Amino acid sequence: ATFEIVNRCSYTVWAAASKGDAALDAGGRQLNSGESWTINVEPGTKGGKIWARTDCYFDDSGSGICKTGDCGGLLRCKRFGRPPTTLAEFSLNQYGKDYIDISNIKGFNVPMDFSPTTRGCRGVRCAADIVGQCPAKLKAPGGGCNDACTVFQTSEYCCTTGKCGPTEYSRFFKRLCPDAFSYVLDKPTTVTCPGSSNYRVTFCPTA
Numbered sequence: 001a002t003f004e005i006v007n008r009c010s011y012t013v014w015a016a017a018s019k020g021d022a023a024l025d026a027g028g029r030q031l032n033s034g035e036s037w038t039i040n041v042e043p044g045t046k047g048g049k050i051w052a053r054t055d056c057y058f059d060d061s062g063s064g065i066c067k068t069g070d071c072g073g074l075l076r077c078k079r080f081g082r083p084p085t086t087l088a089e090f091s092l093n094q095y096g097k098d099y100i101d102i103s104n105i106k107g108f109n110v111p112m113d114f115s116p117t118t119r120g121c122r123g124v125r126c127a128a129d130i131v132g133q134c135p136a137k138l139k140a141p142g143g144g145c146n147d148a149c150t151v152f153q154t155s156e157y158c159c160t161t162g163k164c165g166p167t168e169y170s171r172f173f174k175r176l177c178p179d180a181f182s183y184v185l186d187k188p189t190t191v192t193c194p195g196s197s198n199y200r201v202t203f204c205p206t207a
Contacts, residue, residue, distance in 0.1 A: 001092055002198040004038045004117065005050065007031035009204035013052040013110060014066060016077040020047060027076035028053075031203075043093045043196055050088040050201050051081050052110040054143050067142035068109040083107040084144030086126060086180075088114040093195040100199070101190045102126050102180040104173040108134075109144035113205040121193035126177035127206050135172055147173075147183075159184035 005015045012032050017024035017039060025039035041048060053069035062075035069085040071077035084107025092098040101124060102114050108130040115123030134145035148169035149158040156164050164185055166174070174182035179189050 001041050001043060001098075001196060002038060002117070003041060003050065004036055004198075004200045005031065006036045006200065006202050007033055007052075007204070008202055008207045009033060009110065010207060011054070013054060013203055014056045014058075014069075014075070015050065015201075015203075016053055016069060016071055016081055017041070017048070017050045018071065018077045018080055019045060019049070020080055021078070023076055023078045024048060024050075027074070027078055028071070029075075030056075041092065046091040046094070048090045048092070049080060050090075050114075051085040052112075052203050053081065053085075054109060068140070068144045081106075083150045084109045084140055084146045086110050086112050088112060088201050090199070092197075096195050098193040098195055098197050099190050100124065100193060101188070102177075104130070104177060104180045104182055105147055105149070105184060107138075107140075107144055107147045107150060108173065108177075110203050111205060113200075113202040115200050115202070116191075116193050117198040117200050118194070121191050121197070124179045124189065124191055125205065126180040127204075128176035130173065130176055133172075133176070135169065138169060138172075149184075157183075 058064035069081035170183035
């Protein structure tokens with residue numbers, strides 16, 4: 001399948017695409033404002049993620065640091081990213097359908113549209129100034145708005161017993177992005193698409 005990753009923000013991002021234990025396609029790439037990067041993801045992939053990283057440095061080999069979303073210091077992510085990271089999430093060709101979501105369960109750093117480029121299903125977006133509003137205790141220094149599990153490490157915020165409720169903090173993300181997951185046991189805002197669909201991830205969409 002095809003995703004096309006586009007930086008419509010006015011600042012450079014370093015896009016990342018991983019499943020958790022391996023890169024997807026090249027695993028990451030720099031995107032100056034306006035730049036599109038199309039990748040190939042295998043049918044049937046489960047639990048894929050696409051995110052932006054901000055304020056990176058990488059040397060000639062590719063090793064470095066980013067202030068949000070860092071994946072073990074690699075330009076080319078083979079693992080997932082340090083919060084706060086807005087997440088595009090997907091598992092493809094499940095049993096005849098792909099399933100797409102955007103998640104604020106690791107926080108928010110960059111606004112995002114994650115829309116299908118082929119018919120049958122609707123996209124999802126979170127574009128609100130979450131970082132401008134973010135509650136003080138959830139602010140990150142380095143940039144972004146952390147989730148409460150990251151800041152406080154409690155069973156309730158992390159949903160560690162499998163029983164957790166909405167919180168004042170989950171609800172701050174759900175007031176501003178209804179269509180995105182705001183905590184682990186949120187009512188699912190997942191989208192079911194035909195198997196083998198293609199997609200576009202747009203950072204800053206409304207930019």
